[PDB]
Design a protein around this nucleic acid. Structure first.
Ligand SMILES: [Zn+2]
Lengths: 454, 134, 171, 121, 102, 126, 74
RNA sequence: UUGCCGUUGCUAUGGC
């Protein structure tokens, strides 16, 4: 048995490498490095923070105050929020408008404050990739990001620019182009409690910036498709996911190194695993992330998977195969064009062309026990991760959001044992990158806010 | 007779048996990721050198760790550099093709003699091999 | 490298003619270098076939050899057998160099345009500008071959000929 | 036998869609039904992908007859939305075609997908 | 615009000092510009501009980053005590020449 | 795929080279050796002195073609079926057949020389 | 007043034949002897050029009804 | 509670 001989010889090999618990167990170099550890400074940014907010089953779920404030902007795309240590929120749309909200009036719907709308006036007079230093967006703003301190919001989209606006007036303070032709930005994330931005640009590139210095730190390379989502916490690590290469990478940005995590679910072995006694299959494209803590994260796929990954395992720890359902099959009055229902039913091939909803938004509350998933099934899902950190489980649903969920994130309130949050979710009737979405089933372009309690 | 303090027998060797085929199989079946670089950052002289091998980037990581750890630049020490840098780069452009060293496939060194086929757990009894299984 | 056995037979001359013309090579030393180390590679894989199944050398050095050949990119992901290392040959190795790859990705109009782009530093894989044409890109650096951002074919400031013509036409 | 008969399963579908995305980046993909039939009657096509769930189905079933005439492999992907997303455009496509090229950096991948869908067909 | 990153900041009370490694970031600039770097370091930390010092600069290939070794003092007098004389000649105020004979 | 003839087999056994292993370490590739029925007829007609050569040509690793002509002239059969198709290596040691094969173009020629096989008109051997 | 040396005393290329601009570069010579070779290959074989370009105009060069350029067996 | 437009509430919904 050749793989048995491989495992056996590898075991003998590791035993021989060990060859080349007592009462005294102290090692001189380890305790010397621990003396240097006692000598050093800056136990602030580099907390390898584990899950210290265990509250998944604690708070209420089923009776949230859900207000779906519809807004008149075609296809809202992103949502950025802010809390100091009054709270503002930000939305941005495919109609080239950024909009500031106040959200701190917690028991009611948010309040519009200020527009900032680019348009055809901001097309540059050059068509030349480094004099892209205009003051507004002329194409398809895809992402906003508020500063952790709140001086600025920074936004960008398919016009390959980063425009950083002031908070108090929504004015463009600085323009930083991405200096090449395909340099469309797709996701932005500040590292927490900082002034450092991580943008993920479709050149298979990740750009980093210091916003209050108007400088770019480091460009870091290495995905294989467009870097569709990004996520960061207080550590200088980052977690990006490229779309169709089906890998999620995490980046030690000062070292400029990474850990890659591929997928790897196969319907052959999965249907055999069920065949030991079923509509589930392989993977299209890993789409969204959120780093839950500094040892784990969660990925949202294109076949409706939500997966939970550790920092110490290439293959994922936990899967959840169907997370928002399978799409309604196309009707017999809109598949075939024959006359009889028998042939128009034969043109469905049974179950072979039922496609699942793909999770287009995922948000893990940082270091907490609970994350929120959203797609165009109409109902957001709330999941909590078990305390042994090897599984998660569906708590409840938030069914007042008709449309695609282009963004989810939460806003905190309450103290250490009694808490209430408003879950913002940007709702559109069209995916945040291309159109591709038919059967617009009662959708509206709005902000689904929910107020969850206890 | 009597004892005599032998650092060569309580010194960490771990290199007589470090074979790259076994280490590659362990990296394959490791189930924890591997700290690879952002892809352009590991080529060396605009491509005039190789990419860099895995042992060379391990050694580079060790040198920069020691470097930052006690605040000292390493030097251009003539005898050691005329040995190691020139012989190392010439066997690098000999055997390292595209970031992968193929020098081992051209080298007689028995795998199972030194690095496999355990010597301490040799199990030279039927009873000892029976107890080692069960 | 090393010279071949019969270096002047007409099949070898038409071989080197087709190779140097189809891949834009400068002399025979490119073919001879890459074929010398390919000879070492498949001379090793021949011995790995001449030993038997469940040999430790065969198991470990065989999957090591085919995995680092797949990661160089001359061998595809599905053929994970050791006889494909014998079926491997020299233009499978020099299709992997950066001049060939720049032309195939279409940043250049021919292999000679690719060679002069590379030697004039308009091409960077990943982070670093590569400037020698025989580079042997890998399967992960295959998709980050793009124009350098320090170059007028990227998005940078235009070169001396363009700016001197602009200045003289401004005069 | 349905009309959209030689459908691919999920592994072959993702192999097809990955090489479709790479050919779309390398300008070797002609996307859309009448561009596909144009390149099919011109003869520069290596295989055609039809999506088996558009709102009529004969709208692209016109293409298997053309592929049969000129001996070109044809395969049915079960999602027009995923096919358009792989094609890299902001709309669903119902048919696409991989044009022939010999200065193409993905020729081995295209040939492997051609062999897989031809043993299917 | 240059950019600054301190890492691994330890304190040496025996030498009355605080030392660290300096990732200096200059996209589309030449190099570190060490006096301007001492200015930027002396303003990100406290004032002591004749007590902040950097010595070990290595720029990586293709530019952009450079790793240096940063040590910052309190008390400019004890910085003059503890720093070596060649770095004092390089940056600060000391200048004693060697007697040129044989 | 390599077409063998009778003096190549005789020189292989006289020099103690295995057929498929000698071919493999000559070309550094996987070889399929082919005995045509006329080469086999010639080895059988060589008599009972050449029993060792005949039952080393009877080897399941050596595949075998089916020539369709009258007579057992292996040089004519090898020359015809190689100049028809140009997908064949010819392993031979006849001086006349070596001259015929190296006069027709694009056909590599293998021969027992010394203590291993040599190959000439194949331009990718290393 | 400095009687500087000139190029023929400096480089000392005494009495050479006229040589080739294509020989002054080893790469351009093999670019232009491969273009010559693959123009000669159209003479010996018939090269697959890429199929039918536009409308089928005709054979454009002639049709011989007497010549058969096919390999007979044995 | 918005680009319009409808039911509107004296606040929620649904069609482009
Ligand atoms: Zn015969």
């Amino acid at each position: 048995n050749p793989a048995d001989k491989r495992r056996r010889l590898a075991k003998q090999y590791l035993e021989n490498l060990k060859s080349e618990d007592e009462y005294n167990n102290f090692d001189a170099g380890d305790l010397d490095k621990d003396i240097i550890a006692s000598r050093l400074k800056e136990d602030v940014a580099e907390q390898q923070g584990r899950v210290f907010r265990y509250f998944g089953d604690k708070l209420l779920i089923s009776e949230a105050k859900q207000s779906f404030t519809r807004v008149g902007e075609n296809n809202l795309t992103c949502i950025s929020c802010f809390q100091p240590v009054r709270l503002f929120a930000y939305t941005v749309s495919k109609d080239l408008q950024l909009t500031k909200y106040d959200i701190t009036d917690f028991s009611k719907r948010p309040k519009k404050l200020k527009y900032a709308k680019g348009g055809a006036k901001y097309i540059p007079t050059s068509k030349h990739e480094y004099e892209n230093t205009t003051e507004g967006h002329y194409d398809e703003i895809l992402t906003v990001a508020a500063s952790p301190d709140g001086k600025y919001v920074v936004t960008g989209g398919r016009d390959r620019k980063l425009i950083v606006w002031s908070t108090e007036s929504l004015s463009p303070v600085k323009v930083i182009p991405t200096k090449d032709r395909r340099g469309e930005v797709l996701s932005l994330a500040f590292r927490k409690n900082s002034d450092q931005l991580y943008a993920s640009c479709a050149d298979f590139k990740i750009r980093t910036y210091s916003i209050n210095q108007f400088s770019q730190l480091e460009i870091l390379y290495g995905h294989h498709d467009i870097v569709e989502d990004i996520s960061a916490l207080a550590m200088e690590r980052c977690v990006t996911v490229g779309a169709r290469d089906r890998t999620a990478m995490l980046w030690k940005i000062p070292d400029e190194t990474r850990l890659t995590f591929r997928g790897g679910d196969e319907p052959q072995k999965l249907l055999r695993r069920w065949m030991k006694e079923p509509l589930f299959f392989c993977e299209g494209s890993i789409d969204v992330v959120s780093m839950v803590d500094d040892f784990h994260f969660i990925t949202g796929s294109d076949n409706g998977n939500i997966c939970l990954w550790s920092l110490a395992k290439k293959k994922p720890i936990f899967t959840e195969r169907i997370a928002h359902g399978i799409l309604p099959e196309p009707s017999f009055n809109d598949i075939s064009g024959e006359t009889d229902e028998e042939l128009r039913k034969r043109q469905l091939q049974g179950k072979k062309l039922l496609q699942p909803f793909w999770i287009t938004s995922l948000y893990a509350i940082p270091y907490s026990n609970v994350f929120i998933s959203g797609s165009w099934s109409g109902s957001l899902k709330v999941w909590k991760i078990s305390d042994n950190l090897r599984s998660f489980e569906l708590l409840g649903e938030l069914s007042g959001a008709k449309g695609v969920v282009t963004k989810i994130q939460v806003v905190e309130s309450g103290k250490h044992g009694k808490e209430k949050f408003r879950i913002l979710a940007s709702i559109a009737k069209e995916h945040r990158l291309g159109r591709w979405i038919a059967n617009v089933s009662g959708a509206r372009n709005g902000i689904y806010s929910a107020v969850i309690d206890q | 007779f009597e004892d005599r303090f032998d650092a060569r027998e309580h010194k960490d060797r771990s290199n007589k048996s470090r074979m790259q085929a076994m280490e590659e199989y362990i990296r394959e079946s490791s189930d924890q990721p591997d700290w690879s670089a952002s892809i352009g950052a590991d080529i060396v002289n605009h491509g005039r050198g190789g990419i860099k091998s895995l042992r060379d980037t391990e050694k580079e990581r060790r040198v920069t760790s020691f470097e930052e750890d006690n605040f000292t630049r390493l030097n251009i020490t003539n005898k050691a550099e005329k040995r190691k840098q020139k012989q190392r780069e010439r066997n690098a452009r000999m055997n390292v093709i595209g970031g992968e060293d193929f020098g081992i496939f051209s080298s007689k060194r028995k795998l199972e003699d030194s690095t496999s086929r355990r010597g301490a757990k040799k199990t030279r009894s039927a009873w000892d091999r029976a107890q080692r299984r069960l | 490298y090393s010279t071949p056995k019969r270096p002047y037979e007409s099949s070898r001359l038409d071989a080197e003619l087709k190779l140097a013309g189809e891949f834009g090579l400068k002399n025979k030393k490119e073919i001879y270098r890459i074929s010398f180390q390919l000879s070492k590679i498949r001379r090793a894989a021949r011995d790995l076939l001449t030993r038997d199944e469940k040999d430790p050398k065969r198991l470990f050095e065989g999957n090591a050899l085919i995995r680092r050949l797949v990661r160089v990119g001359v061998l595809s992901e599905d053929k994970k057998k050791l006889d494909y290392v014998l079926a491997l040959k020299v233009e499978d190795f020099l299709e992997r160099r950066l001049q060939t790859q720049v032309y195939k990705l279409g940043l250049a109009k021919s292999v000679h345009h690719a060679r002069v782009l590379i030697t004039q530093r308009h091409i960077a894989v990943g982070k670093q500008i590569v400037n020698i044409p025989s580079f042997m890109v890998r399967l992960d650096s295959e998709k980050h071959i793009d124009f350098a951002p320090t170059s007028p074919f990227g998005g940078a400031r235009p070169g001396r000929v363009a700016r001197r013509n602009a200045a003289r036409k401004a005069e | 036998n349905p009309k959209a008969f030689p459908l691919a399963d999920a592994a072959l579908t993702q192999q097809i869609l990955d090489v479709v995305q790479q050919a779309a980046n390398l300008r070797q993909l002609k996307k859309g039904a009448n561009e596909a039939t144009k390149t099919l009657n011109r003869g520069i096509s290596e295989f055609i992908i039809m999506a088996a769930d558009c709102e009529p189905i004969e709208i692209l079933l016109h293409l298997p007859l053309l592929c049969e005439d000129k001996n070109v492999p044809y395969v049915f992907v079960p999602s027009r939305v995923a096919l358009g997303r792989a094609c890299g455009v902001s709309r669903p496509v119902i048919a696409a075609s991989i044009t022939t090229n010999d200065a193409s950096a993905i020729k081995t991948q295209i040939y492997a997908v051609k062999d897989k869908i031809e043993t299917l067909l | 615009a240059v950019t600054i990153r301190t890492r691994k900041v330890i304190s040496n009370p025996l030498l009355a000092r605080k030392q660290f490694v300096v990732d200096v970031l200059h996209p589309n600039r030449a190099n570190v510009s060490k006096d301007e770097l001492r200015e930027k370091l002396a303003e990100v930390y406290k004032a002591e501009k004749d007590a902040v010092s950097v010595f070990g600069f290595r720029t990586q290939f293709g530019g952009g980053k450079s790793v240096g070794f940063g040590l910052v003092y309190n008390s400019v007098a004890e910085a003059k005590k503890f720093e070596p004389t060649y770095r004092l000649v390089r940056y600060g105020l000391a200048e004693k020449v060697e007697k040129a004979s044989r | 795929q390599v077409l063998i003839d009778t003096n190549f087999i005789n020189f292989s056994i006289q020099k103690k080279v295995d057929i498929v292993r000698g071919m493999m370490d000559c070309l550094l590739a996987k070889c399929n050796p082919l005995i045509t029925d006329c080469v086999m007829a010639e080895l059988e007609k060589l008599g009972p002195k050449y029993r060792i050569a005949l039952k080393l040509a009877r080897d399941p690793r050596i595949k075998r073609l089916s020539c369709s002509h009258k007579g057992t002239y292996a040089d004519d059969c090898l020359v015809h079926r190689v100049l028809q198709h140009k997908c064949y290596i010819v392993a031979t040691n006849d001086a006349g057949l070596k001259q015929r094969i190296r006069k027709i173009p694009g056909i590599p020629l293998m021969s027992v020389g010394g203590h291993a096989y040599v190959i000439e008109k194949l331009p990718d051997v290393f | 007043g400095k009687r500087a040396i000139n190029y023929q005393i400096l480089k000392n290329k005494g009495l050479t034949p006229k040589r080739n601009k294509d020989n002054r570069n080893s790469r351009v010579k093999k670019r232009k002897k491969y273009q010559k070779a693959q123009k000669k290959l159209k003479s010996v074989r018939a090269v697959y050029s890429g199929g039918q370009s536009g409308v089928y105009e005709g054979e454009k060069t002639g049709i011989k009804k007497g010549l058969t350029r096919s390999v007979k067996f044995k």
